């Protein structure tokens, strides 16, 4: 599923991501835009052989099991395929664990490089929330 900007903002809010660990909803929408272009089915292979999955490009090295990332962990206790669902519950729950891990949203390289320190509220501006 390819979410619209306000539609994703609404879903993220429903699943309790708005101000989670202090990150306003625009941070989450901005990160999703640059990680996946709002597409739940996005997958991208990394040089190390791990793969990133879903709307927030969660990586198989640490967070989910895809059967093909040697030495990896599955700290969200889910198959990486669960992260590609049209329903974002699994992605949200896993992102809550990731952003709690110590480095906040810096875990998401696209957030650090394209969202951090910008006007992230623009990503939610205009939305009925
Ligand atoms: Cl957009
Ligand atoms: Cl915001
Ligand atoms: Cl594996
Ligand atoms: Cl599994
Ligand atoms: Cl933080
Ligand atoms: Na894994």
């Amino acid at each position: 599923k390819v979410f619209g900007r306000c539609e994703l903002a609404a879903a993220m809010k429903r699943h309790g991501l708005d101000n989670y660990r202090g990150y306003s909803l625009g941070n989450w929408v901005c990160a999703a835009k640059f990680e996946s272009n709002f597409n739940t089915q996005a997958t991208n292979r990394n040089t190390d052989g791990s793969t990133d999955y879903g709307i927030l490009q969660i990586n198989s090295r640490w967070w989910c099991n895809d059967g093909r990332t040697p030495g990896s962990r599955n700290l969200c206790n889910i198959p990486c395929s669960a992260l590609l669902s049209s329903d974002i519950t699994a992605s949200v729950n896993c992102a809550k664990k990731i952003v709690s891990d110590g480095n906040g949203m810096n875990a998401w390289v696209a957030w650090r490089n394209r969202c951090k320190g910008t006007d992230v509220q623009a990503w939610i501006r205009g939305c009925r929330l």
Side-chain angles (χ1 to χ4, degrees):
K1 180 178 166 164
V2 176
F3 274 83
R5 178 176 66 86
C6 292
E7 183 186 15
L8 180 60
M12 281 176 160
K13 181 167 173 169
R14 178 162 94 80
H15 286 88
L17 214 43
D18 56 313
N19 213 225
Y20 191 88
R21 290 283 300 210
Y23 290 92
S24 68
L25 189 57
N27 284 281
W28 295 103
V29 175
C30 184
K33 168 67 181 181
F34 293 127
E35 284 296 350
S36 68
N37 204 19
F38 302 145
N39 182 355
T40 63
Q41 294 194 268
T43 61
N44 286 289
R45 195 89 186 254
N46 303 134
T47 51
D48 72 353
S50 66
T51 300
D52 294 341
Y53 292 87
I55 197 87
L56 289 166
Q57 289 292 276
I58 291 169
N59 190 228
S60 61
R61 169 79 48 214
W62 292 105
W63 304 103
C64 60
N65 174 59
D66 65 5
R68 61 165 204 197
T69 308
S72 74
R73 300 285 287 280
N74 176 12
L75 298 177
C76 293
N77 297 116
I78 48 170
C80 296
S81 62
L83 296 176
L84 299 182
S85 176
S86 59
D87 184 302
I88 68 168
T89 304
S91 286
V92 173
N93 291 344
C94 192
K96 290 175 173 175
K97 188 165 286 143
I98 295 163
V99 74
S100 303
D101 190 57
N103 302 123
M105 284 194 74
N106 300 109
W108 288 276
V109 183
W111 176 86
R112 182 174 47 82
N113 292 326
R114 308 176 72 174
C115 295
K116 184 178 189 180
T118 79
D119 181 17
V120 297
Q121 193 275 329
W123 287 100
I124 60 163
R125 182 161 309 142
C127 306
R128 183 177 201 87
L129 291 159

